[PDB]
């Protein structure tokens, strides 16, 4: 019934991918969408109907950007060298240089048909068009005149309302040069900066220099029959970004250093979040405790506050000389820990903060997960004469860890790439001294790779970071499959 209508869209939108270039996003659109109709039509592949729409998202908005960003590793994609060839030359063709001079223009109605008027200040003589109509690209051949136009001058609003039609009007003087709309009160002789002939050769009209696309560096360049036109365009560079990771000494030293921090940070986080979460989870549903519901919500409240604002308020509270934590910390004690300047102290801050954010997730886990333990084990333990600490380490803990293991190795993987925490709180921590690329002491692998690609200064090589992201990902895949 609906297979035909949807089947037509798989073709209507699919053929438009083939047109307008875009081979990169033309294959996947057919393959994924053909599978949907392939699956949902017949009732032999019934099981895939429930899996398709979930794995469609995995394909589109997780797997594709991964496969795509791996292809970015085999090229010089950067801030300078960002666009494709067709966008880059279109950017160069779009700009212009002022060949002629400025003329103050006016707009005067003659019935429905409008009328334009220009004025040259160098000569003093004025020019004016015939009764034209707005719409489409038209060349208004102006005529010199001493007299005034009939009808009142059009105000800004009126000429603004006809900005689109007035910009397409390319007027020209009796024996002067061509001229177009530059502002709402001025016309000026705007002309293309470059011109593209048959073969790929742009040529400047002002200076008089030809440029050819050097597809090694990825820029337009000139040869002595040199200048480099720096809008830039992407071009493949095989195994260069990858080999630079193994070649570069400055990049290689902190690469493993942060890997130790990254893993340790995610380990310590998981331990403390579980430990605090589980202990609280046990206490909250402990028979004898009174204000359970009151205690329960208060301990959850942190989780009700978005991470990114809790981090930014902590960023303020943890200030070294000022900030309210050290205002107290040099009152009960006589110390002000360098939460930002010192690597270790900054790592302690990260963990203390991160635990504050992380324990509620673990508590809510352990709370419901603890009700999986039947009551009569503790009643049996009460007959034997076990205390709270004995009940915890001999029954509760070893019985909770088994189901909790997958969630806390999943919690490890989360913290392993906890980008938002590092960027917002420390932005990588104290800078590692004597590095080529930007690296700090609280930087994770994900932060380091982000810092390389985007952060101003220290290069903005998207292709290099794309290689490192690939280089890391495949190692974690090799680690995860073996584990």
């Amino acid at each position: 019934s609906v297979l035909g209508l949807l089947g037509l869209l798989v073709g209507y939108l699919v053929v438009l991918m083939y047109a307008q270039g875009e081979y990169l996003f033309a294959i996947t659109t057919l393959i994924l969408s053909s599978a949907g109709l392939y699956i949902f039509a017949n009732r032999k592949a019934y099981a895939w109907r429930y899996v398709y729409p979930g794995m469609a998202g995995m394909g589109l908005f997780v797997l594709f950007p991964l496969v795509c960003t791996i292809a970015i590793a085999f090229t010089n994609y950067s801030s300078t060298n960002q666009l494709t060839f067709e966008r880059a030359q279109e950017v160069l063709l779009d700009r212009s240089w002022q060949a002629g001079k400025t003329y103050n223009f006016g707009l005067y109605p003659a019935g429905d048909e409008w009328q334009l008027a220009l004025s040259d200040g160098e000569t003093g003589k004025n020019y004016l068009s015939d009764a034209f109509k707005f719409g489409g690209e038209q060349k208004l051949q102006l005529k010199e005149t001493t007299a005034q136009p009939e009808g009142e001058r059009a105000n800004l609003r009126v000429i603004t309302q006809n900005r689109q039609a007035l910009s397409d009007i390319t007027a020209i003087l009796p024996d002067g040069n061509k001229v177009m709309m530059s502002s709402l009160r001025q016309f000026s002789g705007t002309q293309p900066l470059y011109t593209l002939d048959g073969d790929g050769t742009l040529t400047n009209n002002q200076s008089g220099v030809k440029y050819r696309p050097n597809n090694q560096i990825g820029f337009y360049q000139s040869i002595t029959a040199d200048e480099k036109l720096s809008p830039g365009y992407t071009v493949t560079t095989g195994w260069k970004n990858f080999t630079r990771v193994f070649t570069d000494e400055g990049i290689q030293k902190p690469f493993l250093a942060i890997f130790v921090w990254t893993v340790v940070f995610s380990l310590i986080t998981v331990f403390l979040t579980v430990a605090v979460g589980m202990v609280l989870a046990c206490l909250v549903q402990w028979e004898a405790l009174r204000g359970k519901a009151v205690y329960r919500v208060l301990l959850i409240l942190p989780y009700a506050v978005p991470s990114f604002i809790s981090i930014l308020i902590f960023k303020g509270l943890f200030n070294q000389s000022f900030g309210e934590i050290n205002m107290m910390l040099s009152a009960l004690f006589g110390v002000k820990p360098a939460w930002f300047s010192d690597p270790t102290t900054a790592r302690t801050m990260l963990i203390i903060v991160n635990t504050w954010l992380g324990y509620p997730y673990m508590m809510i886990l352990c709370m419901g997960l603890l009700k999986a333990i039947p009551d009569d084990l503790y009643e049996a333990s009460a007959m034997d004469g076990a205390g709270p600490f004995q009940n915890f380490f001999k029954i509760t803990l070893p019985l909770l860890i088994k189901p909790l293991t997958p969630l806390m190795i999943a919690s490890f993987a989360f913290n392993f790439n906890n980008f938002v925490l590092i960027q917002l709180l420390t932005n990588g921590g104290p800078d590692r001294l004597g590095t080529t690329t930007p690296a700090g002491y609280t930087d994770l692998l994900v932060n380091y790779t982000y810092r390389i690609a985007f952060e101003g200064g220290g290069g903005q090589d998207f292709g290099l970071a794309a290689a490192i992201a690939t280089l890391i990902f495949l190692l974690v895949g090799a680690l995860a499959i073996v584990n």
Binding site: P374, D376, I395
Partner: protein
């Protein structure tokens, strides 16, 4: 060891689930709490155990008060209905859990574990885990735990409840031979009146959280205090026929049957305290053949249960919405729907009032 209760009560703020009730359980005495589900059998055991608090009254174990005393220091052990086996531990670790904590003893554990493992046949299952074991095996590991503890009092909350009937039948013999070997006090909760009769030195019957009667199994069987105790104990349920009183001698009481022919019969029973709509209690086993007795009860055979060892026959007696059940040893050839009569001996009939309380039979039953 000598556990006893004095007006022990249980409630949850206002509604009293268990009334003020007394028990006097002597040393080494096998006691069985019986009754339907949710009638406060486990509540009683758990109040004795310390798993539940005593709302009011006084509990005494070994002649000292235990209401405020916690479970561990009551000299007691429990076998839980779900066995309460620690699934993250082995059998050996399960059984030795009690004394592993509090006084860490390597050689003492191994001794008591293997000693108890011998008698229960869990010596080869010591290394196994509760998930690997069968219902029967897990059930023995549960008792094995309490036996390793060696408490003065044994509490058991329906230990054979989920086992097969054949295995359940077998495990009563094991329990009895275990009890008489150790000779220590046991409290034993069960819904199966058969288990009580076979195991109990003293049966305590409970009716919606109320001790109906206390005494020896054969005492409760022959002489029920009320219609519930009579109705509870007995393999097939006791037959209850509404009857009208006619005479009332000092020695015995008479009744009138509801049948088309209004027959009369004297019954040797306590006549202390006419025209009362009483219930005539009589068990299927105590019914006779019609040729022998003078009091006959003829009717239509509805259902015939051929059990091999016996034949239980349901008889539609006229003028009564209650099939008179009959019971006789060996197989008996009777058709479903055939006319059949049976004898009713007055020496074996019970008598109950409108309220439910039973008139005491003056017939000297053997056993009591």
């Amino acid at each position: 060891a000598s556990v006893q209760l004095q007006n022990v009560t249980k409630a949850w703020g206002e509604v009293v689930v268990s009334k003020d009730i007394n028990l006097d359980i002597h040393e080494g005495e096998f006691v069985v709490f019986v009754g339907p589900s949710g009638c406060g059998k486990s509540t009683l055991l758990r109040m004795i155990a310390g798993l539940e608090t005593i709302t009011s009254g006084d509990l005494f174990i070994g002649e000292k008060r235990m209401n405020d005393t916690p479970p561990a220091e009551r000299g007691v052990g429990m076998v839980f209905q779900s066995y309460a086996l620690y699934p993250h531990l082995s059998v050996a670790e399960n059984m030795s859990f009690g004394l592993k904590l509090a006084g860490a003893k390597k050689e003492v554990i191994n001794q008591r574990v293997n000693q108890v493992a011998e008698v229960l046949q869990l010596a080869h299952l010591l290394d196994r885990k509760p998930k690997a074991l069968s219902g029967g095996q897990r059930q023995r590991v549960a008792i094995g735990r309490t036996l390793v503890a060696e408490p003065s009092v044994f509490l058991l909350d329906e230990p054979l409840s989920n086992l097969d009937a054949a295995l359940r039948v077998q495990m009563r013999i094991e329990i009895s031979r275990l009890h008489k070997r150790l000779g220590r006090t046991m409290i034993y909760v069960t819904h199966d009146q058969v288990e009580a009769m076979t195991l109990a030195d003293k049966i305590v019957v409970l009716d919606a959280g109320r001790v109906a009667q206390v005494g020896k199994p054969l005492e409760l069987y022959h002489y029920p205090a009320d219609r519930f105790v009579a109705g509870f104990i007995g393999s097939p349920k006791m037959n209850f026929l509404p009857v009208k009183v006619t005479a009332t001698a000092i020695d015995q009481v008479q009744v009138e049957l509801p049948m088309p022919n209004r027959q009369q019969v004297w019954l040797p029973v306590e006549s202390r305290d006419v025209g009362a709509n009483m219930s005539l209690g009589i068990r299927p086993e105590h019914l006779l053949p019609s040729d022998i007795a003078d009091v006959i009860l003829e009717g239509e055979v509805q259902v015939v249960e051929q059990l091999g060892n016996e034949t239980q026959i349901h008889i539609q007696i006229p003028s009564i919405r209650q099939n008179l059940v009959y019971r006789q040893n060996d197989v008996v050839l009777v058709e479903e729907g055939a006319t059949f009569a049976i004898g009713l001996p007055p020496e074996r009939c019970h008598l109950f009032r409108e309220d439910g309380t039973a008139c005491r039979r003056l017939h000297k039953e053997p056993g009591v």
